[PDB]
Coordinates of C-alpha atoms in Angstrom, one line a residue:
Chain A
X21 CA 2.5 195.9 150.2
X22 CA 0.5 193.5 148.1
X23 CA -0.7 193.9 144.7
X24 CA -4.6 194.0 146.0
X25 CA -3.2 196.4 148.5
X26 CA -2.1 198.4 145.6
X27 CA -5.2 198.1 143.7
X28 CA -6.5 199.7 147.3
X29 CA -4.1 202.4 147.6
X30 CA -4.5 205.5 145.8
X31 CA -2.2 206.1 142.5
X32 CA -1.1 209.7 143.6
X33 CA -0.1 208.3 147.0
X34 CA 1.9 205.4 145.0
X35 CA 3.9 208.3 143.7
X36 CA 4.7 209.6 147.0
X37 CA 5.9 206.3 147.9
X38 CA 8.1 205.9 144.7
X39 CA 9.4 209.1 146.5
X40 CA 10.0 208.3 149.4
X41 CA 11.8 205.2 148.9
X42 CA 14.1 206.9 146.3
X43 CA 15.1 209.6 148.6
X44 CA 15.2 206.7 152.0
X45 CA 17.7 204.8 149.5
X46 CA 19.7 208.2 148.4
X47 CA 20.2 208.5 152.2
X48 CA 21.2 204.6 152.9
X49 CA 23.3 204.8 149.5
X50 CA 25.6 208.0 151.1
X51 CA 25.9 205.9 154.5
X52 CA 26.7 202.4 152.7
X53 CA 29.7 204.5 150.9
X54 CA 30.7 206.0 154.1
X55 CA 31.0 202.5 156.1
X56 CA 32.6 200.9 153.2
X57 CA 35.2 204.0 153.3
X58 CA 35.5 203.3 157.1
X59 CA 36.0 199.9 156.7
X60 CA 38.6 199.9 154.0
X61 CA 40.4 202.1 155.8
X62 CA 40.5 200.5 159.4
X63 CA 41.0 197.5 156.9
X64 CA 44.7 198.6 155.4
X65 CA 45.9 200.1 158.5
X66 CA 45.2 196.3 160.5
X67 CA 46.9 194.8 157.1
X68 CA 49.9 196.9 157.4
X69 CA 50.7 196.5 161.1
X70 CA 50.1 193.1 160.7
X71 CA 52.2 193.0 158.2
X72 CA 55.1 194.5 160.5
X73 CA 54.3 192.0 163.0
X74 CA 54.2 188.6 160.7
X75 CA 57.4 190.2 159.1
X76 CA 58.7 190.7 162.5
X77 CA 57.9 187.1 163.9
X78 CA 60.2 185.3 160.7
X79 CA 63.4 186.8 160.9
X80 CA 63.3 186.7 165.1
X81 CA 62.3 183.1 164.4
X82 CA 65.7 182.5 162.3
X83 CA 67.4 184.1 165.1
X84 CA 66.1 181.3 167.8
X85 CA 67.5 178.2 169.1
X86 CA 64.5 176.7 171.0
X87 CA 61.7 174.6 169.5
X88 CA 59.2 176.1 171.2
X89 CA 60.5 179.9 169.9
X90 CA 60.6 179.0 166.5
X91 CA 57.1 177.7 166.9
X92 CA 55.8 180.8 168.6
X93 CA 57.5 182.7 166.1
X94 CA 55.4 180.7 163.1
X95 CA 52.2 180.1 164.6
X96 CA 52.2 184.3 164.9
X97 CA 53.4 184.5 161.1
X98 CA 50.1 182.8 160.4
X99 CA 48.6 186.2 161.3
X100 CA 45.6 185.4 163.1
X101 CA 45.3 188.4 165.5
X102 CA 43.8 186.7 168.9
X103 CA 46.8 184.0 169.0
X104 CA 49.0 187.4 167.8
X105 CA 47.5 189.2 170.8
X106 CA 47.8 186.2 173.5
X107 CA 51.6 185.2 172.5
X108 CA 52.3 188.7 172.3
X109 CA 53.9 188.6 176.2
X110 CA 56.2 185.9 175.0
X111 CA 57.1 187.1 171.6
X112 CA 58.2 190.2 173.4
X113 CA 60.1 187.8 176.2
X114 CA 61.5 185.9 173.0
X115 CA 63.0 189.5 171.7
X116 CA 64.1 191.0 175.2
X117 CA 66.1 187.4 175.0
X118 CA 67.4 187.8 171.1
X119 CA 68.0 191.8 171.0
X120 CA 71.4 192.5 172.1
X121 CA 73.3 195.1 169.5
X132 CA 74.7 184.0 154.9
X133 CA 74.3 183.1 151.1
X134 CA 71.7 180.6 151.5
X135 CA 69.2 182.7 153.5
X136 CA 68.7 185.3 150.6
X137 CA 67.5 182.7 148.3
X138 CA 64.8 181.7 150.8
X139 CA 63.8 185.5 151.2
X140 CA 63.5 186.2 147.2
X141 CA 61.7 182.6 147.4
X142 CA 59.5 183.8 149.5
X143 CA 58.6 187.1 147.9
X144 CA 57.9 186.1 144.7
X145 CA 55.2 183.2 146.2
X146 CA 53.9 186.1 148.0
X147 CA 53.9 188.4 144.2
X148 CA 51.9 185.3 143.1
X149 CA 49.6 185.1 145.6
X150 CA 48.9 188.9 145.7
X151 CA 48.5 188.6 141.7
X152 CA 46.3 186.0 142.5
X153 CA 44.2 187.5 145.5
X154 CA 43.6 190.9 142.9
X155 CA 42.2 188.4 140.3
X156 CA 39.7 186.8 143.2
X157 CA 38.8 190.1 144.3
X158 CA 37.6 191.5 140.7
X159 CA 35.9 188.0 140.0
X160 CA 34.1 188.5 143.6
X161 CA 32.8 192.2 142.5
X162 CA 31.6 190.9 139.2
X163 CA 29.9 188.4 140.7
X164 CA 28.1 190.4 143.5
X165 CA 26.7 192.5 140.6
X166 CA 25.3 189.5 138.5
X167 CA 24.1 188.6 141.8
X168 CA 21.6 191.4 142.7
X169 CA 20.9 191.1 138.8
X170 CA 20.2 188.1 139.1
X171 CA 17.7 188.0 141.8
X172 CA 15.7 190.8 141.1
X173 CA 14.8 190.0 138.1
X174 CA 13.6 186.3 139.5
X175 CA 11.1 188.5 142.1
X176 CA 10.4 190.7 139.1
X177 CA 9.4 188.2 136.9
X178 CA 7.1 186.4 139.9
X179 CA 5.2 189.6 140.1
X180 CA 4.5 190.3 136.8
X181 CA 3.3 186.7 137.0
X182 CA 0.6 187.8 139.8
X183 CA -0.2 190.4 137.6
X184 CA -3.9 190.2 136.4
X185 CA -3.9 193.6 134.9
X186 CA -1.1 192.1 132.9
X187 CA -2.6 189.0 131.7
X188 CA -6.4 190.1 130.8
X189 CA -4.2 193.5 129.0
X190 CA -1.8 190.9 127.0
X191 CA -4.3 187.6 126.8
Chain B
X2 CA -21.3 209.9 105.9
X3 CA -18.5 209.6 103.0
X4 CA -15.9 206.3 102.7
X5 CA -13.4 207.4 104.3
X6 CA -15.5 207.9 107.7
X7 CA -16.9 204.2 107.4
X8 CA -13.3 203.0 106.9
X9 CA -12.8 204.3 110.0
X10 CA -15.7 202.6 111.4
X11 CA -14.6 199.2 109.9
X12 CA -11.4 199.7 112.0
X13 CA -12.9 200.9 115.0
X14 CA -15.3 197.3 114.7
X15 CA -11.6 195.9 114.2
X16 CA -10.1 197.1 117.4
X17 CA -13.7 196.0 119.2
X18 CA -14.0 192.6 118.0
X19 CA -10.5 192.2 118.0
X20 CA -8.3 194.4 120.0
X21 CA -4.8 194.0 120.0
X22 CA -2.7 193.1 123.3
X23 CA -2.0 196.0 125.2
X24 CA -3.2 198.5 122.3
X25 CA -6.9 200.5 122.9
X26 CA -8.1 203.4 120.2
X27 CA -11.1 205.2 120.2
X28 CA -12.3 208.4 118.2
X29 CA -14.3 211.2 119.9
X30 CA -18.0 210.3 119.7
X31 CA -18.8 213.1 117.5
X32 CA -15.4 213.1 115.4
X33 CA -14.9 210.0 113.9
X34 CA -12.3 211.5 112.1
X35 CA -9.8 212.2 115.6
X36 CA -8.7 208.9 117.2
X37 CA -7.4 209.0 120.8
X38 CA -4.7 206.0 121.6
X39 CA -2.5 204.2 123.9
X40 CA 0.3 202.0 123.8
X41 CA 1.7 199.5 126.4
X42 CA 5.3 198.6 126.6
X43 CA 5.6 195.7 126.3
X44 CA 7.2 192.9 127.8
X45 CA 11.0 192.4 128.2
X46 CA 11.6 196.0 126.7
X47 CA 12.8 198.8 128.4
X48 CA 9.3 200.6 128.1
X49 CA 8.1 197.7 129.7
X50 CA 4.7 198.5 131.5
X51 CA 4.4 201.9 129.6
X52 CA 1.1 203.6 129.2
X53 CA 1.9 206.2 126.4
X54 CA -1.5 207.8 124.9
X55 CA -1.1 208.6 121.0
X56 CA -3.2 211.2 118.9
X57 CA -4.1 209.8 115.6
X58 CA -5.1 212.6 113.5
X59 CA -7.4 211.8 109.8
X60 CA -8.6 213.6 106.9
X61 CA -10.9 212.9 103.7
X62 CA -8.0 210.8 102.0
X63 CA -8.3 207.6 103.7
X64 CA -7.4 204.5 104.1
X65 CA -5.1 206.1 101.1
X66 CA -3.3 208.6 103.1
X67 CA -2.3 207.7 106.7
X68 CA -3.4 210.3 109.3
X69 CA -0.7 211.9 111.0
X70 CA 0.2 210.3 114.5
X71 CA 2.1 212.1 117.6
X72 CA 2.7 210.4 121.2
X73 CA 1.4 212.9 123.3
X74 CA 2.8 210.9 126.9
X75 CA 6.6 212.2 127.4
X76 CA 8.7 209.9 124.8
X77 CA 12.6 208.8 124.7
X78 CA 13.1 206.6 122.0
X79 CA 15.2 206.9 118.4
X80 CA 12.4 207.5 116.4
X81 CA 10.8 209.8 118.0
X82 CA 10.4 213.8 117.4
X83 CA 10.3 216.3 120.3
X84 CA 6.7 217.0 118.9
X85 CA 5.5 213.0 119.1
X86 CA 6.4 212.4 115.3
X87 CA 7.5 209.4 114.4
X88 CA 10.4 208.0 112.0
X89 CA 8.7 205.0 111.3
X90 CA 8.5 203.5 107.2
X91 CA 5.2 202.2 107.7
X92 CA 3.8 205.1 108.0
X93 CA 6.3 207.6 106.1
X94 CA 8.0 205.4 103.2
X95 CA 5.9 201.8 103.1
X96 CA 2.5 202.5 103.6
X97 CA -0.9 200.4 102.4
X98 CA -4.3 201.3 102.9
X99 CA -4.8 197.9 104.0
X100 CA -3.3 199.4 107.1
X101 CA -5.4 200.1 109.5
X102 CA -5.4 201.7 113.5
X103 CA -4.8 198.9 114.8
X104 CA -2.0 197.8 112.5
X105 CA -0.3 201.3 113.2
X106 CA -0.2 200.7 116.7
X107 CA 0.8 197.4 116.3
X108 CA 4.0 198.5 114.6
X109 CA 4.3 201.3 116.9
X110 CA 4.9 198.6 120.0
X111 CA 7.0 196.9 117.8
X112 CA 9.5 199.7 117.5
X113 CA 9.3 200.0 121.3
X114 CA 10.9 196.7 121.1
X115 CA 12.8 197.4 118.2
X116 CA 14.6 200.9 118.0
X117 CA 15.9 201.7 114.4
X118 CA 19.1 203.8 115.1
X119 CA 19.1 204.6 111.1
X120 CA 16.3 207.0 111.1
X121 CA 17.0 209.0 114.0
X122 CA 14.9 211.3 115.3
X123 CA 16.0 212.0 118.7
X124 CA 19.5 212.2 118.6
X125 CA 20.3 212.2 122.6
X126 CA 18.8 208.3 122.6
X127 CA 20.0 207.1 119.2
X128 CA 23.4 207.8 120.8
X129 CA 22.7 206.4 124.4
X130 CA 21.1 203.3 123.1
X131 CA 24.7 202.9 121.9
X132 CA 27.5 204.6 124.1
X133 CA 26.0 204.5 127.8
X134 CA 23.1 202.0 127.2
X135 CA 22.5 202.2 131.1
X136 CA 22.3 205.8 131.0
X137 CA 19.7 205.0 128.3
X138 CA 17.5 202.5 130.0
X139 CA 17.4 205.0 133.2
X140 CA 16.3 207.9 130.6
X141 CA 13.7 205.8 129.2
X142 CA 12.3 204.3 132.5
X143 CA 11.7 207.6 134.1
X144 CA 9.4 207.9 131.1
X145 CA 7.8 204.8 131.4
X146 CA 7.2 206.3 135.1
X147 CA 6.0 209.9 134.3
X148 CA 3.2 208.1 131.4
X149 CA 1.5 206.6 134.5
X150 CA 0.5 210.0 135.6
Chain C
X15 CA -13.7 193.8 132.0
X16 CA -13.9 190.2 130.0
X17 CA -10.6 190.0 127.5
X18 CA -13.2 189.7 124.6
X19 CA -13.7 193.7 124.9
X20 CA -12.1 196.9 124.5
X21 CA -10.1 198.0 127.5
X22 CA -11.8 200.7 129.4
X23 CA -11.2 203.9 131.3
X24 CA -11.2 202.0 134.6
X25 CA -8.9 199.0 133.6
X26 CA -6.0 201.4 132.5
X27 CA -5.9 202.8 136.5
X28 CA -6.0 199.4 137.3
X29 CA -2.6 198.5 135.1
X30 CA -1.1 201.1 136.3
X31 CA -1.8 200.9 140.2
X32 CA -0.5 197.1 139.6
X33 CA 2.8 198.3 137.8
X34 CA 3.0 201.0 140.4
X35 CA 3.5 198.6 143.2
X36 CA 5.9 196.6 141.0
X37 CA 7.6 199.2 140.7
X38 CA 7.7 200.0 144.5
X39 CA 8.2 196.2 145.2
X40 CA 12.0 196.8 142.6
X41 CA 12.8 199.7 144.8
X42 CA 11.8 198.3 148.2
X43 CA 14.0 194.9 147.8
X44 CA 16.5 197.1 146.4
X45 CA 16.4 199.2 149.3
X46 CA 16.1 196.3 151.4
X47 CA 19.1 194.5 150.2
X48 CA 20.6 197.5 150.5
X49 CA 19.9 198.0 154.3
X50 CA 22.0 193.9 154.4
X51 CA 25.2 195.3 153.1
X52 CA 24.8 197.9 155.2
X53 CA 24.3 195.9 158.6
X54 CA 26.9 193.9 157.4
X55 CA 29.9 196.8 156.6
X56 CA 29.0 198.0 160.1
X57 CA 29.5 194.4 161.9
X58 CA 32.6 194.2 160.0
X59 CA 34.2 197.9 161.1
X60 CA 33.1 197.1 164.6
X61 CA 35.5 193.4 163.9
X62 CA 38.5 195.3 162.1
X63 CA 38.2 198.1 164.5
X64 CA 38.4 196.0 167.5
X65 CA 41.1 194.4 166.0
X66 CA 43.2 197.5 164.9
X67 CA 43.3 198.7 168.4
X68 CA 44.3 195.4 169.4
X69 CA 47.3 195.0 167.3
X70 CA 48.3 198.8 167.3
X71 CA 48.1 197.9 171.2
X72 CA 51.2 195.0 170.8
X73 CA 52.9 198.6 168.2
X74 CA 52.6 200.5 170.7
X75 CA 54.9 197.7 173.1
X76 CA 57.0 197.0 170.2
X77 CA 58.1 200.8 169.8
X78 CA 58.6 201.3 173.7
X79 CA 61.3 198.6 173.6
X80 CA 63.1 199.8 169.9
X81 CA 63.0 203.1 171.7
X82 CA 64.4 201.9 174.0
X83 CA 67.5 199.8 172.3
X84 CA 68.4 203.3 169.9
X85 CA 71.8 204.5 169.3
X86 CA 70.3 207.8 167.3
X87 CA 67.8 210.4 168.3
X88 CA 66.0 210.1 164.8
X89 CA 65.5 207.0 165.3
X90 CA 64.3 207.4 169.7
X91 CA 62.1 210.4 168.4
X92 CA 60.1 207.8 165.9
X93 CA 59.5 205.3 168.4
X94 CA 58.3 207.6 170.6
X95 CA 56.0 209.0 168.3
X96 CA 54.6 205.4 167.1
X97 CA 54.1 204.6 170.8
X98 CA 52.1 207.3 171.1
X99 CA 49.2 205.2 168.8
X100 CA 48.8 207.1 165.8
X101 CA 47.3 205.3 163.4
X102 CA 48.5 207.6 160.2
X103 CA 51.9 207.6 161.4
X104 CA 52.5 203.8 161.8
X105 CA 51.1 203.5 157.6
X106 CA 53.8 206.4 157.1
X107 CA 57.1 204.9 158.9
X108 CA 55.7 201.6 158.1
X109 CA 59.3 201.1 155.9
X110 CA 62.1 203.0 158.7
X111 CA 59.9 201.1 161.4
X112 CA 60.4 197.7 159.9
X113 CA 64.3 198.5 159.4
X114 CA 64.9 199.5 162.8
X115 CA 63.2 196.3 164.3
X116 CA 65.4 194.7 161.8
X117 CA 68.2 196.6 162.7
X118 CA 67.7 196.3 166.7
X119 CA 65.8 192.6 166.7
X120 CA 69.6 190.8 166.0
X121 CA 72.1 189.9 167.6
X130 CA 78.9 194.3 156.4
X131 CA 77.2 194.5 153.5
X132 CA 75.3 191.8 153.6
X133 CA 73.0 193.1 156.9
X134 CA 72.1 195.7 154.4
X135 CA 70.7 193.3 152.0
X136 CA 68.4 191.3 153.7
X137 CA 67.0 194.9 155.6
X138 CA 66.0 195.5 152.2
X139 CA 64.3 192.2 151.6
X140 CA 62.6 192.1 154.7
X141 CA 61.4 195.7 154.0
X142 CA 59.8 194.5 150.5
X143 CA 58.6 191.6 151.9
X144 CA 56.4 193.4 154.9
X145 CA 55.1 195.3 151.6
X146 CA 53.6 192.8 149.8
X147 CA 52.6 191.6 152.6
X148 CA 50.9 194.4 153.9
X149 CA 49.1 194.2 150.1
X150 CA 48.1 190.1 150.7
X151 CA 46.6 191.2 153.8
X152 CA 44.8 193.9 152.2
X153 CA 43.2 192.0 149.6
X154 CA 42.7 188.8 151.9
X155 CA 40.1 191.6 154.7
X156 CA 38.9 193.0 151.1
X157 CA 38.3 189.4 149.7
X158 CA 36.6 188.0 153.3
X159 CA 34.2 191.0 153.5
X160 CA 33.2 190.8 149.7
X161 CA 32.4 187.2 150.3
X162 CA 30.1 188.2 153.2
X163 CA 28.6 190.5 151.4
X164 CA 27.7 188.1 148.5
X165 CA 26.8 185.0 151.3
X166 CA 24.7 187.8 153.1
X167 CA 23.1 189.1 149.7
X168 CA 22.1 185.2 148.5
X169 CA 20.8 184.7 151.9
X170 CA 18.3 187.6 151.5
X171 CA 17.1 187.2 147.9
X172 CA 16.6 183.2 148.4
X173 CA 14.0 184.2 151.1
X174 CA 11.9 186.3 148.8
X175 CA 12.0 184.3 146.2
X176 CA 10.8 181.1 148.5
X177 CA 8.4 183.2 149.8
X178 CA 6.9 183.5 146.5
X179 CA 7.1 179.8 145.8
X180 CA 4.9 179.1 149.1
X181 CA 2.3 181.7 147.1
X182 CA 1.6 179.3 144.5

C-alpha cells in the first residue's frame, strides 16, 4: 500500500496482486458497460415520452383561452418531470375541456424546428467535446500520481543519480 | 593474460568507478571474456522501469571487434531479433574500439528511447509503433512487466 | 548501496519491488476511479428509472383517454396496448401515438400539415432530450472523476 510496504512484501506476491487487480477490474469493466447500457436505455425511452408530452403540452396550449392554461401548458413544455408529474391532473382536466372531435402558425412550427436542428447540432458537438475531455482527464491525472511516485522512488534516484 | 582480456578489465574498472545510470555489467569471475548485463528503461519511455538482462559475448579480437550482444529478458522493440540481436549501427555498421561496455549499453538505452523504424528487426513493432501505437505501448509494457520476473 | 558503486544483486530486487508497487498503485487508482463511474451510472439508472416509470405513469393516462375518444379500432387497439405500460411499444408508435393525440387533442388539408410538423418536431425533440440525459450524466461523470483524482493528488502534497 506504500512503497516501504512494498519493499516488505514479497515480489512473487506483488505478481499475484498485479493479478488480482487486473482480473477485479475485468469484472468492474463488464459491469460499468452493462449500467452504462442500462442507463442509456432507460435514458432514450424517458427522452422520447417526454418528448410526446412537451410536444403534447404546445399545440393544447395554442388551443387554450385561459392565462393560467397556457401557462400550465408552457411551464410542462419546459420538461422538468416532477412539475410534469404534479400538473399532470390538470393538463389532463385542461384536455378533457379542449378534446371535443392558419398560415401564420406553420411558420412558427418550422421556426421552431430548425432552432431545435440547431440545438440538437449543437448538443452532439458538447457531447463529443465532453468524451474527449473525460479521456484527457483520467490521462491527465494519472500521470500527476504517477509522476509523484516515481518521485518517492529511492530505488529510482540512487539507480539514475 | 593477453590485451584483449585487460581491455576488458579497463572497462570493467570503467563501469566501477563510473557506472552509468541505470546500466550494471559484470563478467563471470573466471571468464573475463563473457559479460552478464542489464538495462533499465528509462524514464519517459515506454520501457520505462525495465529490467532487461543482456549477454555480452567476446573473443581474442578486441576492443577491434565488438563482441556479439543478445537481450536475453523477453524484448518488443524495432530493432530487435527474436534471438536478442540487435539492429543497432554502433555495433554493426559504425563501430570504434574506443567503444567500450559501457558505451554499448549506453547506446542500447538510447534506442529504448529512440526506436529506428529503418532497420527493422521485428517487424510486428516496427509496424505498431506506427499504425496502432497503443496497441504498441500495451505490447511493450507487458514486457517491461514479464523482465521483473 | 552508496551511488559511487556498482549496483548489486540486492538493489535490483529492490527496483523492482518499488516499480512493482507503482505499478499496482496505476492499476489500483485506475480501478478505483473506475469503481466512481460505476457508483455514479448506478445513482443515475436508479434517477432515470424512477423517472421513466413516472412519466410512462402520466402514458399510460394519456392513452386511456385517446382510447377512449377513437373513431377506429386500429387506432382503440394501440391505446389499449400503450396503456398497458410497455416500454418497447411506446419507442415503436412513438410517431401514430403523437398523431392521434394530435388528431383527438383539437377541437382540410391544412390539419394534415401541421400533424406532420408536430410529428417531426416530437423527433428532434425526442433526440435534444437524448443528448441533454447523455450530456448531464457525462458531466457527472467528469465532476465525479476530478473530484476523486484532486484527492490523491492532495494527499500526496500533504506527504511532502
Amino acid at each position: 500500500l506504500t512503497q516501504s510496504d512494498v519493499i516488505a512484501f514479497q515480489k512473487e506476491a506483488l505478481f499475484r496482486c498485479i493479478n488480482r487487480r487486473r482480473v477485479d477490474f475485468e469484472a468492474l469493466r463488464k459491469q460499468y458497460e452493462l449500467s452504462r447500457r442500462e442507463c442509456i436505455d432507460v435514458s432514450r425511452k424517458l427522452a422520447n415520452i417526454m418528448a410526446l408530452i412537451v410536444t403534447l403540452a404546445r399545440f393544447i396550449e395554442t388551443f387554450c383561452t385561459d392565462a393560467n392554461e397556457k401557462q400550465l401548458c408552457r411551464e410542462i413544455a419546459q420538461g422538468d418531470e416532477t412539475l410534469i408529474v404534479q400538473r399532470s391532473d390538470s393538463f389532463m382536466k385542461l384536455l378533457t375541456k379542449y378534446g371535443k372531435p392558419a398560415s401564420d402558425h406553420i411558420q412558427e412550427l418550422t421556426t421552431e424546428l430548425k432552432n431545435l436542428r440547431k440545438s440538437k447540432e449543437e448538443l452532439f458537438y458538447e457531447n463529443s467535446q465532453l468524451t474527449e475531455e473525460i479521456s484527457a482527464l483520467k490521462e491527465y491525472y494519472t500521470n500527476i500520481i504517477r509522476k509523484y511516485d516515481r518521485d518517492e522512488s529511492f530505488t529510482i534516484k540512487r539507480v539514475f543519480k | 593474460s593477453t590485451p584483449a582480456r585487460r581491455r576488458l578489465m579497463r572497462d570493467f574498472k570503467r563501469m566501477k568507478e563510473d557506472a552509468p545510470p541505470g546500466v550494471s555489467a559484470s563478467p563471470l569471475p573466471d571468464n573475463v571474456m563473457v559479460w552478464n548485463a542489464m538495462i533499465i528503461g528509462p524514464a519517459d519511455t515506454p520501457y520505462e522501469d525495465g529490467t532487461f538482462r543482456l549477454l555480452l559475448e567476446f573473443d581474442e579480437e578486441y576492443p577491434n571487434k565488438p563482441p556479439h550482444v543478445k537481450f536475453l529478458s523477453e524484448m518488443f522493440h524495432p530493432n530487435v531479433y527474436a534471438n536478442g540481436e540487435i539492429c543497432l549501427d554502433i555495433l554493426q555498421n559504425r563501430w570504434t574500439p574506443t567503444y567500450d561496455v559501457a558505451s554499448i549499453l549506453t547506446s542500447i538505452q538510447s534506442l529504448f528511447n529512440d526506436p529506428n523504424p529503418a532497420s527493422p528487426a521485428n517487424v510486428e513493432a516496427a509496424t505498431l509503433f506506427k499504425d496502432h501505437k497503443s496497441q504498441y505501448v500495451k505490447r511493450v509494457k507487458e514486457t517491461v512487466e514479464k523482465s521483473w520476473e
